[PDB]
Amino acid sequence: GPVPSRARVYTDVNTHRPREYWDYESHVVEWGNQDDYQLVRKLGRGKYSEVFEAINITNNEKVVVKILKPVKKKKIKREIKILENLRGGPNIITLADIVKDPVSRTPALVFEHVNNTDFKQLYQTLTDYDIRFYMYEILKALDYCHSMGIMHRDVKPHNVMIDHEHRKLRLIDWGLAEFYHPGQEYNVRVASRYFKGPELLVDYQMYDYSLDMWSLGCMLASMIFRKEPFFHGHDNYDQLVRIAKVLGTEDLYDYIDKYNIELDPRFNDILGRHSRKRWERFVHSENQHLVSPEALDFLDKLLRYDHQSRLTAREAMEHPYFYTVVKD
Ligand SMILES: O=c1oc2cc(O)ccc2c2oc3cc(O)ccc3c12
Numbered sequence: 001g002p003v004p005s006r007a008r009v010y011t012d013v014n015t016h017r018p019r020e021y022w023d024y025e026s027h028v029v030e031w032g033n034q035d036d037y038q039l040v041r042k043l044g045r046g047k048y049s050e051v052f053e054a055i056n057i058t059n060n061e062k063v064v065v066k067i068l069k070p071v072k073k074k075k076i077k078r079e080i081k082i083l084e085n086l087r088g089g090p091n092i093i094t095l096a097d098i099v100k101d102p103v104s105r106t107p108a109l110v111f112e113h114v115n116n117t118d119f120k121q122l123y124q125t126l127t128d129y130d131i132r133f134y135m136y137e138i139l140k141a142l143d144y145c146h147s148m149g150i151m152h153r154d155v156k157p158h159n160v161m162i163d164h165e166h167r168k169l170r171l172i173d174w175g176l177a178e179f180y181h182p183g184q185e186y187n188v189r190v191a192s193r194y195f196k197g198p199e200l201l202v203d204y205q206m207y208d209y210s211l212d213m214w215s216l217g218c219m220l221a222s223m224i225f226r227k228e229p230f231f232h233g234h235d236n237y238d239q240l241v242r243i244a245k246v247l248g249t250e251d252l253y254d255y256i257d258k259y260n261i262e263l264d265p266r267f268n269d270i271l272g273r274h275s276r277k278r279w280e281r282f283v284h285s286e287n288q289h290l291v292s293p294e295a296l297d298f299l300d301k302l303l304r305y306d307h308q309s310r311l312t313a314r315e316a317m318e319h320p321y322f323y324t325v326v327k328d
Contacts, residue, residue: 001260002204002206002259002260002261003258003259004183004206005207005208005259005307005308006182006183006208007180007182007208007209007210008308008312009146009209009312009314010149010180010209011180011182012182013148013149013180014149014179014180014181015181015182017149021149022081022149022179024078024080024081024082024179025077027081029077029080029098030098031098031099031100032098032099032110033099034099034100034101034102034108036056036057036058036097036099037054037055037056037057037063037065037097037099037108037110038054038057039052039054039065040052040053040055041053043064047069048068048069048071048075048175049066049067049068049069049175050066050067050069051064051065051066052064052066053065054110056096056110061113062113063096063110063111063112063113064110064112064113064114065109065110065111066109066110066111067101067104067106067107067108068104068106068108068109069104069106070104070106075175076107078177078178079109079174079175079177080095080098080107080109082150082174082177082178082179083095083109083174085148085150086144086145086148086150086174089141089144089145089148090137090140090141090144091137091138091140091141091144091169091170092141092144092145092170092171093111093112093114093170093171093172094111095109095110095111096110096112097109098110111172112170114161114163114168114170115163115165115166116162116163117162117164119157119158119160119162120228122162122164123157123222123223123226123228124226126223126290127290128289128290128292129324129325131223132321132324132325133167133325134160134169135216135223135321135322136325137169138155138160138169138216139216139313139316139317140317141169141170141171142155142171142209142212142213142216142313143313143314143317145171145177146180146209146212146312146313149179149180150177150178150179151178151180151208151209151212152171152174152176152177152212153176153177153178153191153211154173154175154176154177154190154191154195155171155191155195155212155215155216155219156191156192156194156195156215156218157219157222157228158173158192159172159173160172160219176190176191180208180209183206185205185206186205186206186207187205188200188203188204190211191211191215193233193235193236193239194218194229194230194231194232194233194239195214195215195218195219195229196215196239197210197211197214197215197307198214198240198243198252198255198305198307199211199307200236201236201237201239201240201243202240202255202256202261202263203261203264204259204261207307208307210307210308210310210312211307212313213302213311213313213316214302214304214307214310216302217299217302217303217310218230218231218303220295220298220299220302221299223290224287224290224291224299225282225283225287225290225291226287226290227282231243231246237264237266237267237270238270240267240271241272244271244274245274245277246276246277246303247277247304247305248274248275248276248277249271249272249273249274250276251276251305252305254305254306255305258306279299279300280296292321294319294320294321294323295321297319297320297321298311298316298319298320298321301316301319302316
């Protein structure tokens with residue numbers, strides 16, 4: 001069968017936590033008062049929730065209310081426990097309250113308000129320094145949740161709220177996040193298509209925190225090369241082919257051979273043979289000001305087939321790419 005895999009960092013953190021910490025099924029939700037919050041306007045509907053801007057009339061402060069769509073109280077408690085565990089951490093969205101919505105008859109998560117401009121216009125105006133700055137901020141968030149035994153599993157521009165004016169950043173939507181337990185097999189149907197790690201695309205279930213680092217690499221590639229998204233697959237199969245046209249097919253086979261994985265035979269007539277490309281290939285006159293040897297080496301160390309070979313969040317923060325970023 002498939003060769004087992006372990007996270008190379010924070011492997012045993014949940015093993016030595018009290019079971020209270022990771023056993024989210026047994027979590028007892030403490031409900032606030034739903035009348036404290038008045039909905040102002042709808043911000044968006046996802047597959048799992050509707051998101052509203054609201055006001056807490058007990059302090060006249062803006063909040064974000066996420067009213068969950070009906071789903072397993074499995075996944076509801078999971079997001080809630082993860083949010084409470086990570087509360088107070090660097091650039092983690094802050095869960096302020098949990099109330100029961102009288103209309104949906106589902107939980108409504110109440111978050112700190114953060115003032116976001118969309119990633120689409122924002123990513124077109126980001127300077128070289130801005131990209132490095134915000135990447136460092138994301139890494140703080142990723143290193144923290146990983147250190148707390150949690151992988152996000154849905155890292156993408158949509159889930160990174162940026163207040164460009166106050167240069168503040170928040171990682172949001174922890175509804176797909178999970179606890180890492182060594183040797184545990186996970187659902188491969190996570191993350192969004194363009195940001196799915198190769199482990200997901202070859203259906204390798206024993207993944208870990210390193211999944212988040214591939215997704216982050218995809219984001220970085222889209223930013224410094226100014227191509228959103230970078231790997232633009234039409235489906236989950238074409239997605240792996242897109243990646244293979246850059247990282248090459250030989251290292252792809254090295255990867256699945258290492259873990260004794262078999263590709264879906266439908267790849268037989270679409271995968272072909274491809275050499276690994278040098279990242280300079282994607283540099284042109286309109287993005288070159290965002291590119292540096294440091295930028296490419298960092299990107300290169302994130303985008304690895306082998307999840308065990310990618311930089312950890314902590315290692316990433318040690319990278320020379322962030323030397324120019326002013327530290328606090
Ligand atoms: O769309 C969202 O989905 C979320 C999901 C979460 O789990 C937590 C927070 C948010 C969240 O905060 C915001 C602030 C804004 O100014 C605009 C949109 C959002 C927004």
